[PDB]
C-alpha cells in the first residue's frame, strides 16, 4: 500500500508515524520520514531536486502538519544533500556532517554541464540543472555523530567507518528498532563505487550489527530486516576477493 504523489514520488507507511518516500524518477531513492512523540518530524536523506523534494515538504505538511522539522544528510551525494535548498527554504534544520558539508562544496567545483552528461534523459538533465545543491546549515564532527533528543526520544547519527562514500553515516530510531543505513546497505550489489572504499566496506558493515532493529532502510530498493547488513557483509566481501 502506496499512495502517489507528483513527479514520481510514492509514500509508503511502514510503522506508526514512519514513512519512507521513494524518488522513483531518480534511482528508486528512499527518504524515511518519522514522527516523533513530540510531534517533531524527523527526514533522513532527500530527493535529488528541488521539484521532487518540494513535493517531499508539501505532503509532509499536509498530512503531518510539523512545527518542527530536523532533515538530516546521509552523505554527500544528491540522494543526500539534494534536498537542502528546499528543506531550508521551508524552514527545516538541516544537519550533516563536516566532512559531507566539505565534499559537497568540492563537488559543487565541478564543471556541471560537462558532469550532468551522464544522464541521456533530457527531461531529468533539465531539472538537474535547474537545482543547485547546497551544504546543511548545522555540521557535527563526523567520527563524533549526534544525538538528537527530541522530548526523550532519541535520534542517534553515527559513522560506521567509509563504505559506500567517505562520509556515509547511518541513522538509528531506538524506540521504533529502525536502522536507516542508506547507501553503504548492499544486499545484491555495491552499485556505484566512484567514492567506494571496497577493503574497509565489510568491517564497516559488521558495525552496524550491533543495533537492535527490526527495521533496516537502505539507499535505493527494497527494505527489509536485520538480514539486509548480512547480505552486504557477504557482497562486500565477494568484492574484496575479485580484486584481490
Ligand atoms: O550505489 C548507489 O548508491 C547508486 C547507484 S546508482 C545512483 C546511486 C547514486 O550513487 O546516487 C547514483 Cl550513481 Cl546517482
Ligand atoms: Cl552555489
Ligand atoms: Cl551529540
Ligand atoms: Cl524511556
Ligand atoms: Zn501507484
Ligand atoms: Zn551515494
Ligand atoms: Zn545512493
Given at each position: 500500500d502506496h499512495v502517489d504523489l507528483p513527479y514520481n514520488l510514492t509514500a509508503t507507511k511502514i510503522d506508526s508515524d514512519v514513512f519512507v518516500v521513494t524518488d522513483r524518477d531518480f534511482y528508486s531513492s528512499n527518504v524515511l520520514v518519522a514522527k516523533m512523540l513530540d510531534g517533531t518530524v524527523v527526514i533522513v536523506s532527500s530527493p535529488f531536486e528541488n521539484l521532487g523534494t518540494?513535493?517531499?515538504?508539501?505532503?509532509?505538511?499536509?498530512?503531518?502538519?510539523?512545527?518542527?522539522?530536523?532533515?538530516?544528510?546521509?552523505?554527500?551525494?544528491?540522494?543526500?544533500?539534494?534536498?537542502?535548498?528546499?528543506?531550508?527554504?521551508?524552514?527545516?534544520?538541516?544537519?550533516?556532517?563536516?566532512?559531507?558539508?566539505?565534499?559537497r562544496l568540492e563537488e559543487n567545483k565541478k564543471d556541471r554541464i560537462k558532469a550532468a552528461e551522464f544522464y541521456k534523459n533530457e527531461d531529468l538533465k533539465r531539472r538537474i540543472?535547474?537545482?543547485?545543491?547546497?551544504?546543511?546549515?548545522?555540521?557535527?564532527?563526523?567520527?563524533?555523530?549526534?544525538?538528537?533528543?527530541?522530548?526523550?526520544?532519541?535520534?542517534?547519527?553515527?559513522?560506521?567507518?567509509?563504505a559506500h562514500s567517505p562520509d556515509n553515516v547511518v541513522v538509528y530510531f531506538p524506540k521504533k528498532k529502525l536502522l536507516f543505513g542508506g547507501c553503504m546497505i548492499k544486499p545484491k550489489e555495491l552499485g556505484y563505487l566512484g567514492d567506494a572504499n571496497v577493503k574497509a566496506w565489510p568491517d564497516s558493515a559488521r558495525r552496524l550489527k550491533k543495533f537492535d532493529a527490526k527495521i533496516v532502510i537502505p539507499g535505493h530498493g527494497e527494505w527489509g530486516g536485520?538480514?539486509?547488513?548480512?547480505?552486504?557483509?557477504?557482497?562486500?566481501?565477494?568484492?574484496?576477493?575479485?580484486?584481490?
Amino acid at each position: 500500500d502506496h499512495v502517489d504523489l507528483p513527479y514520481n514520488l510514492t509514500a509508503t507507511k511502514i510503522d506508526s508515524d514512519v514513512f519512507v518516500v521513494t524518488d522513483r524518477d531518480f534511482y528508486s531513492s528512499n527518504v524515511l520520514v518519522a514522527k516523533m512523540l513530540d510531534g517533531t518530524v524527523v527526514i533522513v536523506s532527500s530527493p535529488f531536486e528541488n521539484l521532487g523534494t518540494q513535493t517531499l515538504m508539501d505532503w509532509v505538511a499536509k498530512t503531518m502538519k510539523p512545527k518542527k522539522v530536523v532533515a538530516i544528510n546521509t552523505h554527500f551525494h544528491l540522494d543526500g544533500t539534494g534536498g537542502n535548498e528546499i528543506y531550508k527554504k521551508m524552514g527545516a534544520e538541516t544537519w550533516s556532517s563536516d566532512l559531507t558539508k566539505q565534499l559537497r562544496l568540492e563537488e559543487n567545483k565541478k564543471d556541471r554541464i560537462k558532469a550532468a552528461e551522464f544522464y541521456k534523459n533530457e527531461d531529468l538533465k533539465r531539472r538537474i540543472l535547474s537545482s543547485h545543491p547546497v551544504p546543511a546549515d548545522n555540521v557535527f564532527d563526523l567520527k563524533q555523530g549526534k544525538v538528537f533528543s527530541f522530548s526523550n526520544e532519541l535520534v542517534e547519527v553515527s559513522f560506521p567507518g567509509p563504505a559506500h562514500s567517505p562520509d556515509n553515516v547511518v541513522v538509528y530510531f531506538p524506540k521504533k528498532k529502525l536502522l536507516f543505513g542508506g547507501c553503504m546497505i548492499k544486499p545484491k550489489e555495491l552499485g556505484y563505487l566512484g567514492d567506494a572504499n571496497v577493503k574497509a566496506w565489510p568491517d564497516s558493515a559488521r558495525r552496524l550489527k550491533k543495533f537492535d532493529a527490526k527495521i533496516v532502510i537502505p539507499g535505493h530498493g527494497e527494505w527489509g530486516g536485520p538480514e539486509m547488513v548480512n547480505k552486504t557483509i557477504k557482497v562486500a566481501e565477494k568484492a574484496v576477493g575479485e580484486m584481490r
